[PDB]
Structures are given as C-alpha cells and as structure tokens.
Amino acid sequence: DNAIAMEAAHSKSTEECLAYFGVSETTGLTPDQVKRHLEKYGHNELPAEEGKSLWELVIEQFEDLLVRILLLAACISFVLAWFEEGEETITAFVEPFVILLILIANAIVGVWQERNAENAIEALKEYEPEMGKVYRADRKSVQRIKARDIVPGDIVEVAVGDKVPADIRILSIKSTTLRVDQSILTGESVSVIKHTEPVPDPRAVNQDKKNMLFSGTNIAAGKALGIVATTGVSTEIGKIRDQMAATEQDKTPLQQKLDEFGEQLSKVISLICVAVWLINIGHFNDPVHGGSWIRGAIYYFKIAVALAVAAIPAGLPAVITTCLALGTRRMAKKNAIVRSLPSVETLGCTSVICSDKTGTLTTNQMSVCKMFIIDKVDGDFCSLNEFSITGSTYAPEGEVLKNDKPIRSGQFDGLVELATICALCNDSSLDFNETKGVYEKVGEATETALTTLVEKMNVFNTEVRNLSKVERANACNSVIRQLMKKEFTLEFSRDRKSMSVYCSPAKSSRAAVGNKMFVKGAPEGVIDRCNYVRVGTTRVPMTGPVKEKILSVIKEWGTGRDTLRCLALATRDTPPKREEMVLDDSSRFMEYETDLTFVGVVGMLDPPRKEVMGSIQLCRDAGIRVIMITGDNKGTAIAICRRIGIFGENEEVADRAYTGREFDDLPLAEQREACRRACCFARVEPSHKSKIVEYLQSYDEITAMTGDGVNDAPALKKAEIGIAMGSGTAVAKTASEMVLADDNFSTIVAAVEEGRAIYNNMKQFIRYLISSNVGEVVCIFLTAALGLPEALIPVQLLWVNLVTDGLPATALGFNPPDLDIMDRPPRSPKEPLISGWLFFRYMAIGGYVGAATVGAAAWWFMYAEDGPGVTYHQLTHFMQCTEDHPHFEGLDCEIFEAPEPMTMALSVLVTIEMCNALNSLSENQSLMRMPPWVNIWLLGSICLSMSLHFLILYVDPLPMIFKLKALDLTQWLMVLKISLPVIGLDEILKFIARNYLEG
Ligand SMILES: C/C=C(/C)C(=O)O[C@H]1C(C)=C2[C@H]([C@@H]1OC(=O)CCCCCCC)[C@@](C)(OC(C)=O)C[C@H](OC(=O)CCC)[C@@]1(O)[C@H]2OC(=O)[C@@]1(C)O
Numbered sequence: 001d002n003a004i005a006m007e008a009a010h011s012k013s014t015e016e017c018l019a020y021f022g023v024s025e026t027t028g029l030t031p032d033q034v035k036r037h038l039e040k041y042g043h044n045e046l047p048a049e050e051g052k053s054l055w056e057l058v059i060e061q062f063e064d065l066l067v068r069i070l071l072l073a074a075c076i077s078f079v080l081a082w083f084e085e086g087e088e089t090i091t092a093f094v095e096p097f098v099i100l101l102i103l104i105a106n107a108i109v110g111v112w113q114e115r116n117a118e119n120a121i122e123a124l125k126e127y128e129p130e131m132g133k134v135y136r137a138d139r140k141s142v143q144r145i146k147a148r149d150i151v152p153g154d155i156v157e158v159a160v161g162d163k164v165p166a167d168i169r170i171l172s173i174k175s176t177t178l179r180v181d182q183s184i185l186t187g188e189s190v191s192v193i194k195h196t197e198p199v200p201d202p203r204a205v206n207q208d209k210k211n212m213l214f215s216g217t218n219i220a221a222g223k224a225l226g227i228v229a230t231t232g233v234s235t236e237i238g239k240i241r242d243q244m245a246a247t248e249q250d251k252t253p254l255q256q257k258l259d260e261f262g263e264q265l266s267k268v269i270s271l272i273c274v275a276v277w278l279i280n281i282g283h284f285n286d287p288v289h290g291g292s293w294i295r296g297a298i299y300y301f302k303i304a305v306a307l308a309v310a311a312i313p314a315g316l317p318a319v320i321t322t323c324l325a326l327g328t329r330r331m332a333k334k335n336a337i338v339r340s341l342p343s344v345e346t347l348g349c350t351s352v353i354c355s356d357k358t359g360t361l362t363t364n365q366m367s368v369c370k371m372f373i374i375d376k377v378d379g380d381f382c383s384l385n386e387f388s389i390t391g392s393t394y395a396p397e398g399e400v401l402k403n404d405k406p407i408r409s410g411q412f413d414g415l416v417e418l419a420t421i422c423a424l425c426n427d428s429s430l431d432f433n434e435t436k437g438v439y440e441k442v443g444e445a446t447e448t449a450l451t452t453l454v455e456k457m458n459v460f461n462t463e464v465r466n467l468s469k470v471e472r473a474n475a476c477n478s479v480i481r482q483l484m485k486k487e488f489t490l491e492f493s494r495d496r497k498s499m500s501v502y503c504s505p506a507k508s509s510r511a512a513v514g515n516k517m518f519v520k521g522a523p524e525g526v527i528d529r530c531n532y533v534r535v536g537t538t539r540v541p542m543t544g545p546v547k548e549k550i551l552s553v554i555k556e557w558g559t560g561r562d563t564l565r566c567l568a569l570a571t572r573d574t575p576p577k578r579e580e581m582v583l584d585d586s587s588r589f590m591e592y593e594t595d596l597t598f599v600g601v602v603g604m605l606d607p608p609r610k611e612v613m614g615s616i617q618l619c620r621d622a623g624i625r626v627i628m629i630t631g632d633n634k635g636t637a638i639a640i641c642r643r644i645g646i647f648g649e650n651e652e653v654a655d656r657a658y659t660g661r662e663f664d665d666l667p668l669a670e671q672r673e674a675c676r677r678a679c680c681f682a683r684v685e686p687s688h689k690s691k692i693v694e695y696l697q698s699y700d701e702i703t704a705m706t707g708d709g710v711n712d713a714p715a716l717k718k719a720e721i722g723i724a725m726g727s728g729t730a731v732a733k734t735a736s737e738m739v740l741a742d743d744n745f746s747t748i749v750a751a752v753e754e755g756r757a758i759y760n761n762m763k764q765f766i767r768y769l770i771s772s773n774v775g776e777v778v779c780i781f782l783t784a785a786l787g788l789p790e791a792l793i794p795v796q797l798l799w800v801n802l803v804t805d806g807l808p809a810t811a812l813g814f815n816p817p818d819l820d821i822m823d824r825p826p827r828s829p830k831e832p833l834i835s836g837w838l839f840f841r842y843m844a845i846g847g848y849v850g851a852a853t854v855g856a857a858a859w860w861f862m863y864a865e866d867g868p869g870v871t872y873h874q875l876t877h878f879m880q881c882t883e884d885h886p887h888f889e890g891l892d893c894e895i896f897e898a899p900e901p902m903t904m905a906l907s908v909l910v911t912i913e914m915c916n917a918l919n920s921l922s923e924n925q926s927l928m929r930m931p932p933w934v935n936i937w938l939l940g941s942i943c944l945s946m947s948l949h950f951l952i953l954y955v956d957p958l959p960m961i962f963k964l965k966a967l968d969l970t971q972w973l974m975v976l977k978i979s980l981p982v983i984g985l986d987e988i989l990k991f992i993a994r995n996y997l998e999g
Pocket residue numbers: 257258260261262264265268269310311766770771773774775777832833834835838839840842843
C-alpha cells in the first residue's frame with residue numbers, strides 16, 4: 001500500500017505514528033510542517049459540488065430532442081408571423097408566442113426541481129464540524145482552528161459533545177474511559193469504548209479499529225488526545241463520498257424509451273418532409289413565370305410547423321408527473337415515502353429485494369424464551385433443566401415454565417446464579433413510560449431482554465406485587481445489584497465474543513478473598529474457556545460428553561423452528577487479583593475470562609413481523625426473489641429463512657446461503673454465480689452490499705437494497721431502488737429512492753404492487769396521447785400530399801394535446817388495476833410500449849383519424865349547405881384562386897381560409913379522442929366486457945373536455961384566436977357520423993387480438 005497519508009494507523013503503535021510524521025505529542029506540528037502537510041495532502045474537507053449555474057441549467061432544458069424541434073418550429077412560426085401581408089396581427093404572433101410560452105413554462109419546471117433537489121453527497125457535509133482543537137508548536141495552550149486547516153500528523157484534542165474532525169489515531173485518553181457515538185456509520189447508537197493499544201490487523205474493519213476516531217462521529221463521553229491519520233477524501237467517511245460520486249445511475253426504462261421515442265420521432269418528421277417534397281416534385285414541371293413562389297414556400301413552412309406540433313405529445317410529460325405525484329401521495333399513506341417520481345416505475349419492475357433482517361424482517365423486540373442449566377452430572381450420565389419463559393414484551397409480565405408447568409425460579413440454585421449474571425453483566429435497564437403506558441427499553445435490545453428475564457424469574461421472591469409500576473421495572477435487578485458490587489466491566493469485543501464484570505461482595509471492608517467474574521457471550525467461545533460446570537451450588541470438571549450435550553441443545557435452539565439467539569453464561573470463581581489486571585488492554589480480556597465455570601444458557605427470540613410471512617409469499621407469486629442480509633450465524637440465518645418463507649422447510653440451501661467469509665474466499669467468477677441463486681447472507685462484510693448489487697445488476701436484475709447508515713449509502717445509490725429506513729440516517733435517506741416510514745419489509749412489497757398498478761395505467765395514457773399524435777400527423781400529411789387547405793393549425797393542436805387530451809389521459813391514470821398484478825412475473829425493462837399487433841392497431845386508427853379530420857374539412861368545402869359548391873380539382877389548387885380566377889370562378893378566394901372547415905376537422909379530432917380514450921380503458925378487452933362507466937373519472941374528464949371545446953367555440957375572444965366558429969346542429973351530426981365508428985374500428989381489432997393471437 002502506497003497511496004497517501006497514514007496507511008494502517010490502527011495497526012501502528014502510538015510511537016510509530018508520532019515517528020511517521022515527525023511530530024511531538026507535547027508540542028505538536030511546527031508552522032513549517034503545517035504548510036508542508038497542507039500542501040501535500042490538501043485541506044481537510046469534502047470537495048465542493050459543481051455549481052451548476054442558472055444559465056447552464058436553462059440551457060439543459062433545451063437539450064432534449066423534441067424541445068429542439070418545437071424551438072425550431074417556434075422560429076419558423078415567428079418568421080412567418082412577421083413576413084406576411086395584412087392588418088390582423090391580433091391572431092398572427094399568437095401561434096409563436098404559445099410555442100415559446102410552453103417552452104418557457106417547460107424550462108421553469110426543470111429549474112424548480114434542481115433548486116429543490118439535494119444530492120446525498122452534499123448531505124455528507126453535515127458530519128464535518130466547523131472548528132477543531134489542535135496542539136501546535138507556535139503556542140502552549142490548545143487552540144481551536146477551522147477543521148479544514150487540520151492536516152495529517154496534527155495533535156488534535158476532542159471531548160464529549162465534539163464532532164470528530166478527522167480520522168484520528170488515539171494517543172492518550174486523558175479521562176477514565178472514552179465512549180464514541182459511531183451511529184452515523186453503522187446503525188447501532190450504542191457508544192463504543194476506545195483504547196490506545198494497536199490492532200494487529202492492517203486490514204481490519206472499522207468496527208474493530210478500537211483505537212481510532214472516525215471523522216464525523218461524536219464523542220459520547222470522555223476526553224482524549226490523538227494524532228491525525230487521514231483527512232479529506234481519505235477519511236472513512238470521505239472514502240464513502242468517493243464511492244458515491246463514482247456511482248452512475250442509469251435512466252429509468254420509461255425514460256430510456258421516451259428518449260428512444262424522440263430519436264425515431266425526429267427521424268420520421270424529416271422523412272415526412274422528404275416525402276412531401278417528393279410528392280410535389282411536379283412543381284419542377286411548372287413554368288417559372290406565373291404562380292407565387294413566395295406563397296408556395298410559406299405553405300411548405302406552414303405545414304412544417306404543423307407537422308412538428310402534430311408529432312410532439314406536449315401534454316404527455318405533465319400527465320406522467322401528475323400520475324406519479326398522485327400515486328406518490330397514495331404510497332405515502334401505505335408507509336412508502338417515494339423520494340424520486342420516476343422510481344415508481346422502477347419499483348414495479350423490481351425482481352430482487354435484499355432486506356436486512358433486524359428491524360425490517362423482524363420487530364427488534366427481543367424476548368428470552370428458553371433457558372437451561374445443569375441438573376446433575378454423574379460421569380457419563382448427564383441431564384439438563386430446560387425452562388421456558390412467557391411474555392414477548394419487555395414488560396416484566398410472565399412466569400417461568402418447566403415442562404409447561406409454572407415453577408418458582410428461587411428453588412433452583414442454578415437459576416439464582418443465572419439471574420445474577422444477567423442483571424450484573426449488563427449495561428441496560430428498563431423504564432416504565434407514563435406517556436405511552438408501556439415498558440420501554442434503555443440500551444441494547446439483547447441485554448434488555450435479560451433485564452426483563454430476571455424480573456420475571458425473581459430468584460429471591462422479592463415483594464414486587466406491592467411496589468408501584470415505575471418501581472416494578474427494575475425491582476429484582478436492584479435486589480441483585482445490592483448484593484455484588486460491580487468493580488469494573490470488561491467490554492464486549494468481536495475477537496472473543498463475550499463480556500464480563502468484576503464483582504466483589506457488599507459486606508467486605510477488610511478482606512481480599514471473595515471476588516467473582518460474571519461472563520456473558522457467544523456459546524462456542526465461552527464454553528471452550530470453561531473447565532468447570534456448576535450444578536446448583538456444587539462444581540464438577542467439564543468433560544466431553546457433558547460439553548457435547550450443551551452444544552447440541554444450543555444447536556437445536558438456534559437451528560430449529562425456534563430460531564433463538566443463544567448466550568452462554570459462566571462465572572470465574574477464582575478471578576485474578578485486582579492488581580494483576582490491566583484494564584486498558586482489551587487484548588488480555590479473553591485471558592482474564594479463562595478458567596470459567598459454566599452456569600447456563602438463555603435463548604432469546606427476535607420475532608419476524610406478522611406481515612412478513614405473507615409478503616414473502618406475494619414475492620413468490622410476483623416472481624420477485626427475496627434475499628436476507630443478517631448478522632445471525634449461517635445456521636440461524638438459514639433457520640430464520642425457513643421460518644419466514646424464504647427457504648422451504650426441507651429444501652437444500654448449501655449453495656443458496658453464504659457468510660461474509662465464505663463469499664470472499666470465492667473467486668470473482670463463483671461470486672457472481674453465487675448471487676443469482678443465494679437468498680441468505682450472514683455476517684456480511686461492509687463492502688459486500690455493493691458487490692451483491694453489481695453481481696445482481698450483471699444479470700440485469702432490478703435490485704432493491706435496504707440500509708440506514710452512511711456505510712450503506714454507496715450500496716443504496718448503486719441499487720436501482722435504494723430503500724432507507726425512516727429511523728435511519730438522513731444521508732441514507734437522501735441516498736435512497738424510497739424511505740420506509742415504518743421500517744417494515746411488507747411496505748416494500750406493497751409499494752412494488754402499487755408501482756406495478758401505476759405503470760399499467762401509465763401504459764394506457766402514454767399509448768393514448770401518442771396515438772393521437774399519430775393520427776394528427778396523418779392529417780397534416782394528407783392535407784400536404786393532396787394540396788388541400790390546412791385542416792388543423794398548430795394553435796388548435798396544442799389545445800388538443802395539452803387540454804383536450806390531457807384530462808382523459810390523467811383520468812386514465814385512475815384506471816382500476818387488474819386482479820392478477822402480483823400473480824405475474826416482473827415486467828421486462830426492454831418491453832416496448834407499442835409493438836406487434838398493437839402497432840398495427842394505432843397504425844389503422846391513425847390512418848383513420850387523419851382521413852376523418854381531413855375529410856371533415858373537405859366535406860364542408862364541397863358537400864355542405866353552409867359551404868360552397870367547390871369540387872375536388874379546385875380545392876387542391878386553391879392557391880391559384882387569386883390569380884387564375886376563371887379556372888376557379890364562383891366565390892371569394894378568402895373562403896379557403898374559413899374557420900368552419902377547420903372547426904369541423906377540430907371537432908372531429910376531439911370527438912374521436914374522447915371515443916379513443918374509452919378504447920384505452922383496456923388493451924384488448926371489449927367495451928362490452930369492460931364498460932366505459934368502469935372509470936367514472938374518465939367519463940367526468942370527457943364531459944369537462946367537451947365543455948372546454950364549446951368554450952373555445954362561443955366565448956368571443958377565443959374563437960378569434962383558435963380561428964373557430966360555432967357548428968350547426970347538422971354539421972355536428974356529420975362530426976358524429978365520422979367520429980363515432982372509431983370505436984367499432986378498434987373494437988374489431990380487439991376481437992382479432994383476442995381470438996387469433998392469444999396462445
Ligand atoms: C407520432 C407520429 C408517428 C408518425 C411517429 O413518428 O411515430 C413513430 C415512431 C417514433 C414509433 C412508432 C411510430 O411509427 C409509425 O407510426 C410509422 C409511421 C409511418 C407513416 C408514413 C406513411 C405515409 C409508434 C408511435 O407507432 C404507432 C404505430 O403506434 C409506436 C412506438 O411508440 C411507443 O411505443 C411509445 C413510446 C413512448 C415506437 O415504435 C415509436 O418508435 C419507437 O421508439 C417506439 C417504441 O416508441
């Protein structure tokens with residue numbers, strides 16, 4: 001290793017650290033070393049975010065392909081609105097202003113999101129304090145400077161309440177003990193004890209670096225001196241920041257398809273422009289003299305703008321946002337806080353969920369269920385006294401049972417010592433809450449279950465029914481505390497997996513014989529140090545058959561259908577002398593906890609959630625793999641998976657469950673192979689959550705991942721759906737896409753089902769709005785191919801694509817979900833929205849729509865009483881009316897600009913899209929099977945859309961702008977004559993889809 005700054009500062013001794021930087025602990029760094037170390041390693045801060053300027057942000061709103069076409073069409077419309085002959089400019093610059101206003105309003109929204117968006121990398125800067133206390137050679141006393149000026153090798157001073165400015169190797173602990181709140185890294189807020197002795201492993205995890213102060217953590221209690229190892233992005237919190245900055249998050253499948261849509265849509269538009277130019281090649285055979293090339297050119301640029309406006313679903317991005325935000329409020333009531341709108345689709349395509357066990361799959365409400373001591377040992381004969389405890393709460397309510405029979409715990413000398421261990425070898429307590437009315441825990445959940453246990457046992461038969469409620473919490477515990485005097489506690493450490501307390505009797509003023517040590521820890525580790533076995537009050541040497549009997553029961557309790565976490569309890573009858581014990585060396589604690597005497601074993605249960613059982617079953621029906629990540633041993637982790645439904649009760653899982661150690665010993669090839677079949681990970685290393693995601697993403701799995709600490713932030717950001725707990729850190733939240741407000745696993749599944757039901761409705765109105773843009777383009781191409789006057793103008797099309805079609809599309813987001821949502825495998829991300837026979841249907845609808853609108857306008861020019869007796873051959877040559885009058889003699893040439901034919905065309909387009917919205921209630925189901933009144937919102941929206949159509953037909957300022965006129969009752973019949981059968985057309989195509997394609 002040859003990167004930068006102090007490498008394995010935790011494995012180096014305090015002398016090797018001071019000699020590395022060449023800095024004295026009493027004086028500190030010289031002002032020359034401050035300049036030198038600041039120039040080499042830089043300042044102690046996370047790098048600033050890229051100040052995306054407002055101008056750069058506005059330009060980003062005009063980088064999409066479709067908004068470029070509208071901008072270009074806005075320019076042509078702006079030019080055409082200038083170079084024109086007339087005096088009516090109240091309806092000239094209207095069209096370009098609307099296109100611009102939509103573009104401006106569109107750019108406004110994009111900025112409104114970026115101003116209100118906050119990345120998780122900037123949330124990490126919440127854990128870096130402003131000031132820091134250092135000792136340098138230019139002064140005597142301690143001086144507080146800005147934390148960004150602290151350099152590696154500095155002699156820093158921290159105390160309780162301070163926030164650790166940098167990664168600090170502890171030199172000297174001035175106070176009695178040092179407790180640090182490393183809650184921002186992991187999830188446990190339990191303060192850990194630090195020391196000054198080196199940790200012999202260079203590649204030890206942060207949990208074992210018991211001589212380090214991590215940048216961002218809080219000093220819980222004490223005061224210490226230390227030397228700065230790393231600063232900036234080299235800290236443990238800074239190494240996480242670099243992993244998050246380097247993580248790239250892809251666009252959602254819908255976003256990738258929309259970007260794909262604009263690509264091909266842009267190609268088709270130009271191709272249509274080519275085709276229109278190819279149809280009117282015959283103008284080359286027309287004489288140069290005669291005709292208006294100035295008027296022939298405006299016509300081609302006029303239909304160009306109309307072609308662009310007819311193609312772009314300008315209302316679609318608003319309906320998606322409306323549908324998403326309304327669905328997000330809906331998920332909020334189901335405890336699913338969705339932080340990113342587009343994630344709702346991604347949540348529906350979820351195929352693999354990786355959830356932590358504790359707090360999510362389980363309730364984190366510990367409770368001691370079973371316990372056993374030694375009944376007697378007579379050579380090879382060996383018997384145990386197994387008991388059972390009732391009450392799943394922390395409340396001291398319940399009794400101890402032996403063979404389903406209530407027993408008095410005070411009648412078993414082994415259970416007396418069992419309770420003494422649990423009450424004294426414990427740093428937690430109880431507290432009866434008067435606001436809530438329940439018994440709450442004070443400390444860890446494991447040690448509190450032991451506190452509840454000694455209250456239920458009551459080995460001394462203390463009068464507890466006479467005491468009050470608040471005094472009932474710590475009744476039997478206090479009785480045991482008055483007996484033995486806790487001298488000191490040997491803290492827990494993962495190396496020996498046990499803790500102990502040194503106790504001396506109360507009445508003992510002039511004595512040195514009588515001390516005891518009470519050890520509590522993991523069964524395998526503690527039993528191996530036991531050379532004796534307590535039986536009631538006596539003691540016998542620990543043999544082989546007896547020791548196997550103990551482990552076998554611990555195996556049955558942890559692997560069986562009980563799924564219990566077992567803790568061995570032992571006592572050191574002859575503890576080492578008080579003076580021969582060094583309390584600063586945590587490496588000699590396992591030494592002090594030797595030559596023990598086995599007492600008994602308690603078995604506690606972390607019960608799974610009452611809804612996890614069936615939620616796992618839905619994922620099986622929905623084709624969603626569930627993976628458990630826990631800290632239980634592999635045997636218990638597998639047993640818990642069998643309990644909640646992940647594993648079958650009797651299926652082979654030798655290749656479907658791995659520990660952190662097992663996973664690392666696998667090569668990268670068998671690692672990626674292990675992730676496609678595993679559903680259980682125990683004792684997971686910190687870097688393994690991201691590795692599991694990458695391997696899952698290599699099989700194109702849409703992966704959800706759970707976390708709550710900054711340690712989980714790189715994995716949350718990398719996963720498609722990062723899922724943070726409402727009780728987690730704010731960094732884990734900002735790094736996640738969804739927050740579980742109740743930390744319940746079942747909320748994940750409920751949000752996936754909701755995410756599926758929203759997209760199925762999203763498919764409809766996406767396919768509905770685009771189907772309208774299809775038929776509109778056909779109408780523009782027909783009126784361009786045939787040489788007809790414009791049937792629809794861009795002003796009208798925008799009203800249709802934003803208002804007239806926007807209300808039904810939004811109502812299509814409220815379509816009732818199917819009954820087999822979670823009975824189908826997850827949707828393929830590559831699955832296109834329109835293809836195959838559905839492609840042909842909208843191909844036929846669009847051809848029909850484009851003909852119906854072009855025909856309705858041409859119908860008024862010809863076969864209408866209100867209209868002229870114009871024929872087909874002159875309607876196509878209408879631009880020659882003003883010049884070649886004898887060829888088209890009859891009426892005014894201004895009649896080819898009448899509003900009546902455009903209104904007929906517009907009213908037809910509106911009526912069809914109202915009918916076509918009903919056809920969008922179901923993809924292939926008929927309206928006879930699924931009636932239109934299935935969606936009341938759709939019917940109401942259609943009523944509103946028509947009422948807004950008559951609005952722009954009568955309210956005098958409006959029909960002048962949109963160039964419309966009120967239709968006669970007869971002309972409205974012709975609208976329905978040509979609009980209504982669009983239902984029969986699509987209904988036939990549905991029948992075909994149901995009887996000759998479903999196989
Ligand atoms: C809106 C107007 C139409 C003309 C258009 O340009 O859309 C096309 C195109 C972009 C696709 C097509 C359209 O293609 C045509 O309709 C062929 C036009 C030829 C007519 C000339 C004959 C004289 C969609 C619209 O066709 C119809 C038939 O439904 C379907 C689908 O669209 C979707 O699934 C929507 C995805 C947001 C897309 O194939 C899509 O391209 C792919 O990327 C997808 C996946 O988008």
